[model samples]
Target: MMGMVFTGLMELIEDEFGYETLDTLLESCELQSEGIYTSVGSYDHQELLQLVVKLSEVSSVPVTELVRLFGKKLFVELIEGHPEIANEMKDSFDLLSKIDSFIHVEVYKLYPQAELPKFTCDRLGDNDIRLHYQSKRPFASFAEGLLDGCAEYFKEDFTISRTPETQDSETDVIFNITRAPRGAENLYFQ
Candidate 1:
């Protein structure tokens, strides 16, 4: 994992849970990085999970829910850090379709050692996409939240239904995404 993700998680915890909670979280976790992160550096992915679990324990929020929220907030950091990718896309689906080929390419350029999730996408229609997500880590909730963030970023309305490939694993999952008509009618679905 990149330090950017660690930094984003730290910021999310502090902002949402308060500085004291973040302070306690860092102190509680036996982390290799000692809860310190630099945006350009890379660290163990397990350290991130440890932080998430510790935060969850402290805050009484489920780990999955917290991770999803972090993913949503992290999308902002991602776009701000590399606006060129998002700038080229007209909408969320456009941006998502290029995740592996384009966006991750840019990410790889910056951190060659970074292990990114794989996304195999099929365009079901002009307004639908079947996205297959695979990663070593079980962070499907994070990815789902990221899709939501992407939709929100473009002010696009969409529904995502997820299906896990393995009974007990989230590392292999599929997301069925359908774009809703924009504007007033979309509000009724919400």
Candidate 2:
């Protein structure tokens, strides 16, 4: 990943979880970033996993939940940092569908060395999308967070029933997203 993503995540953690805790976690993990990330550099994906793993251990929060939460918060950072992106899409689903072809194509132009995940999407009915996410790194929770953030942004409540293609030791997952009726409660995560 590039600095844009890492910097946002590290900064938010410092603000939310405190710098001392972040520093300690990074130190334990031997992450050279040490909570100071560049906005235009590339870092190892393992650095992210190690930091989050240490944080999960100290906070007693599951690593799965931490990554998901990080992704959710990162969505805000994504839009806030790039307001033009917010103007491009009418709703979350539009944004989600365009992630690979439109948004990422544009992202790579700016950050050429950026290691991004691939999202192959299939249309399911009029409102749902069968999204296949594959990444070199295990951060599908981050992707889910972005999906949930889009749904939240558009006020489009959805029930994301997932069928994990795990046990292959690969982070290739399928998300079957179906929009629920309005006024529905949070059923984004299972």
Best candidate (score: TM-score): 1
C-alpha RMSD of each candidate structure in angstroms? 3.6, 3.9
Candidates in order have lDDT scores of 0.72, 0.70
The TM-scores, one per candidate, come to 0.79, 0.77
lDDT of 1 by residue, 1-190 (tens): 5677777877777888699988898787766645575776766667667776787778888977776777778887777876776678777656666677767787689777776666677778876778776876655666678888877666668877765456367568667787666554546553
Instruction: State each candidate's clash count.
Output: 0, 0
lDDT computed for candidate 1: 0.72
Quantify how close model 1 is to the true structure by its C-alpha RMSD in Å. 3.6
Using lDDT as the measure, the top candidate is 1
Cα displacement (angstroms), candidate 2, residue 154, comes to 3.1
Which stretch of 10 consecutive residues in model 1 shows the poorest summed lDDT? 181-190
Clashing residue pairs in candidate 1 (N, C-alpha, C atoms within 3 angstroms):
none
62-118 per-residue lDDT for model 2 (tens digits): 877776777767677777877888888877667666777778888789778766666
TM-score, structure 2 vs. true = 0.77
Q: Give the Å shift of residue 87 in candidate 2.
A: 1.1
- Model 1: lDDT of residue 4: 72
